[PDB]
Amino acid sequence: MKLSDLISRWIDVEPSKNAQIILRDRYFMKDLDGNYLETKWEDVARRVARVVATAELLNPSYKKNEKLDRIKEWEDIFFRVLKARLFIPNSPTLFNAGLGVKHDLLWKPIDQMTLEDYEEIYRSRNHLHMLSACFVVPVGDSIEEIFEAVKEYALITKVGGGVGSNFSELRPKGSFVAGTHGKASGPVSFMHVFNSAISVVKQGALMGILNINHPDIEEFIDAKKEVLNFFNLSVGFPMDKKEILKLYEEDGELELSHPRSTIRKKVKIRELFRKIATNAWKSGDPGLAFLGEMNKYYPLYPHRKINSTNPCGEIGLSDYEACNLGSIDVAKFYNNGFVDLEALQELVQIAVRFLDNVIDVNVFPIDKITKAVKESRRLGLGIMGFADLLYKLEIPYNSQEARDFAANLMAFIALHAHRTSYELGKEKGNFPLLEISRYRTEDNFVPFAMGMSNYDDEIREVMKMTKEFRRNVALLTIAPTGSISNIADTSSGLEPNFLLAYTRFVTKEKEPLLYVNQVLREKLNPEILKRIEKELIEKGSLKDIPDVPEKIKKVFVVALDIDPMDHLLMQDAFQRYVDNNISKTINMPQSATVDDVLNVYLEALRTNVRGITVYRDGS
Amino acid sequence: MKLSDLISRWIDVEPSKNAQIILRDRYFMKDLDGNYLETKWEDVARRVARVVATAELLNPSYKKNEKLDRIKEWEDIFFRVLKARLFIPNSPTLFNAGLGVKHDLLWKPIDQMTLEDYEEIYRSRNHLHMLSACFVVPVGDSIEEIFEAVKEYALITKVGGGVGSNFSELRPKGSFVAGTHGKASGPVSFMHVFNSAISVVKQGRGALMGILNINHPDIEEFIDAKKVLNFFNLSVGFPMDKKEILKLYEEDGELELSHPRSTIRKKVKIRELFRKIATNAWKSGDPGLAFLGEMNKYYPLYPHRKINSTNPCGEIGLSDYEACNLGSIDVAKFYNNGFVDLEALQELVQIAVRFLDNVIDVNVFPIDKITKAVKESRRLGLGIMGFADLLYKLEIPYNSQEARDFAANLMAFIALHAHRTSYELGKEKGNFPLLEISRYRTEDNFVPFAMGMSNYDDEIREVMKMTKEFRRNVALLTIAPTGSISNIADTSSGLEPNFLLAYTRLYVNQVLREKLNPEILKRIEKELIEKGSLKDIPDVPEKIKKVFVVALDIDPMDHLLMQDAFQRYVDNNISKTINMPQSATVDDVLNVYLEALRTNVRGITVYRDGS
Ligand SMILES: Nc1ncnc2c1ncn2[C@H]1C[C@H](O)[C@@H](COP(=O)(O)OP(=O)(O)OP(=O)(O)O)O1
Ligand SMILES: Nc1ncnc2c1ncn2[C@H]1C[C@H](O)[C@@H](COP(=O)(O)OP(=O)(O)OP(=O)(O)O)O1
Ligand SMILES: [Mg+2]
């Protein structure tokens, strides 16, 4: 089926009372008086489509003759795709698109649009017109560079960004300093200033990484252990995953040392890992960031280096680069027991152009961010609605079937997204750094592991083509998507549903109202539903409810029906066809041990995953 | 008597065991291995005199083969003055002079010195060669300027400085921000970022001054802030005339709290605001009061430039990026048969002004903007220590009109020669860049202090007129707390009365040791330590009791009026603690504030005993 027929299927399906609360609440634009300029998702779609279409002004392939015709084609498709809720860019695009523009222009009927109207749009985008979620910022080993970094954190937070850094350059606590009477405070201690800044720069989340071999890593691992309340913390592995696993298997020892200090220590890697596991078992921090693995697949490595992730870990970014993200609701592509690949391919092509066009209309806070982002044009196209898509197809999440489906779906998306970047690199010019990148200076470079799909050969084929024409250094990610999947009424990201039923009280002049997963309602006797429904919200799962068919219980699994390894292996299935990283919570039961956590980390080291986040139920 | 003969009286008087502990501890330079390069106060004096002499390299008035001879003359005089402990520059000069210089050059016999040796000194001064105690740094109303200021705090603290800011530009908590989808956090919450920054940048920590204006919407939060901000001293700013605040208070009037970039306003009774300040100071000592308007009234460059903040101790009102450049004369060493030797004191004043002015030239500042603000105004902070001890010698009670009349003439005499010396140096060396736009130039009869308590007044107006033509420095005088350098000099601190006559910080007052009969001392020594004063000790003559008063024998108004006596002949500010008895009430504090508003004082610090 054609994307246009799928669009009609969906375009008039209105957001739920749920979604609408969130939209009114955070997304519908308001005038300076606090009054609504938007009162309907349709207004947001019009405004965002119009703004992103405007980047077509810069297309070197359009004669000025055509610009208005072709821009207005793009606003139309972008508009229809967004209103159908088939693809949603991420939150900042929806908040900040059109800020600075005359209000009479953002919602004008598209047939009343002049070229002058579009150029005026392009020119009146103010400094709040920031449309990326997150950035990476370096923090060098000097007072100057540390506090220049703190300033950049504050400046990025002001305009709504999240930020991450690797703090490993900072010389260990106690260390000699040539230019002071003080001993260096060390990374953990300075991170408090970073956390202070953010406690006072408000919006209406950070990533702090330290490397496994830093003299202060033990202090770091226990850092948030009663602050650093605004930090997520991860332990960085800049070396090969293979090498860490081998050291571990041998019960070996790691040398903790820093280039600009004489402080060193030897620790057993098993003991270090247990200390990480114990803390994660307790509080969920710190995660693991396999920076080596990210750099293994980084087209620009070692000209550029990936030292940190963004707060959610799903993009490894080099210094000053930005998260540029949006998501397709694959649950809307279910058609009679199959994924409509024809309609999905069109959307991929449109989505990659959409996200690539956000770069052109995006106002960044620092000049160095503009530069990093113009030079690589890294995109983050992902998916949401996959948990719900699986329910529809009657595939259990915790099954090899689901993982094979996942890898093929991802590989299909990868292929077309990367083909589209060829197309666009041809039509608009390549990303500035294509020449020094591995797509050029190398034979057979693929920016991910593959090896779980029949699309592999066609992908290597496209990767070869992109030696000549490539708009984007990387195209794919899987983000958490909490808010935009709520707007789209779908499951978040690649994550299983956390609950099938939960009670959400709508405050009035209070009065509880029940949600049951919509795909379940569609596939269970409302008969059976009415009785069990009460016990379901009590027990959180379908597992142990007596009179519910076997194969409703098998398919309608939630997060905690699914064991830690089944979580981890879904992550690996997607990671194999994603050129950035993956946001995946490895959920563990309350009854999980520290050893069970260790076993997840060991398996992580053998799979293709680029990071780990564990959350133990009840911790 | 001549300064040279006074020098010989003092030059071989060795620091006490006390002083020597402090010197070994913090002041004697050490090699990279932690070994001592200096073992005697003499080494410090040689090192510092040589480095400060080096600025003579830049004298436009010295020709050739006249240069080396005249530099060596200055090193020699600076040397002898420092070693006699007649004048000491403040701590940073003592710590950091000669950092970066070959060790074989700093302590070389002066007769072995070539011009090449001096030029080499001047050129190897490294980034730790920072010789100023404190700075003022602006904090504009944007995220960019806030955190750019935070960076500066950190950078200054790294090289040893303390820093003050007025945070009143920051828009009130809850206010509208265009560039953001959030509301302004307020100056009190942004101060936390600054404290946090300092908590982490360590020195061996930094003192800070945080000021918020009396009419800022957040002043009540501010007054109660440290009730953290543990690294801040806080004071309430009064940018308006003192007259106007005193009047509003007398009328039981109301103050508008407003901010140019917020719609948040409020009206408060000025009496209730003051009571809230007094209650907090009564408890904890903070916040002090900064009479910014009054400092600007006497600021030669107002309104081209404006004084918005003090340094952490409040004795220098500084405009943006300016630096404290301080040093003190031990006046107790100028006692000579019931009189102050004005002949020797006048010579030292001229030398001490030249010394402090030469510190500017060999100072390495952390930010370019500080270098600029300092080169342009050349503000100096010449002060005194040993004043309390000087009064003991002269047998003048601190808490007496006699003492305050003495203090004003002493201060006026010092101001006269210090300002004369700035004429002389403006002639010899060139004027401070901004002389032409300053009130010494663009005005008739501008005096940078109140005066009005001395026979020297006319001679001072006369010198102020001369300095329309030639002036090296925008201001020259300050009275600093001086705790460490008075310990080195074995003298009382600043203008403060002694806190105690006998103790452990030890430590029996030397002047008392000399007057009070031996044995009549030992029979009372025990009880002086216990009761803290001589007041209620049987059988110490009534006249030893009257002279040898300590801080808490002197009532709050007598403290305050001493402050006023000096402030009338000081062009910067005064560091004076208004000590109050434990039994003082919140109304007694309010009464101190009210009197402060009537006198010529530019700020207030109260400390109630036992709080
Ligand atoms: N005063 C201080 N207190 C705590 N840490 C400090 C202090 N000064 C510097 N540091 C830390 C911050 C960085 O981690 C590291 C580098 O400091 P930096 O500003 O580069 O000193 P420097 O560059 O003059 O000396 P060096 O030659 O040893 O790098 O030391
Ligand atoms: N997100 C924020 N949270 C808390 N305080 C903020 C935030 N953003 C700004 N502020 C404070 C810092 C300053 O006191 C004041 C000015 O912010 P600023 O960075 O100037 O915004 P702006 O300059 O883009 O907006 P404007 O045009 O109104 O000055 O508000
Ligand atoms: Mg450095």
Ligand SMILES: [Mg+2]
């Ligand atoms: Mg601004």
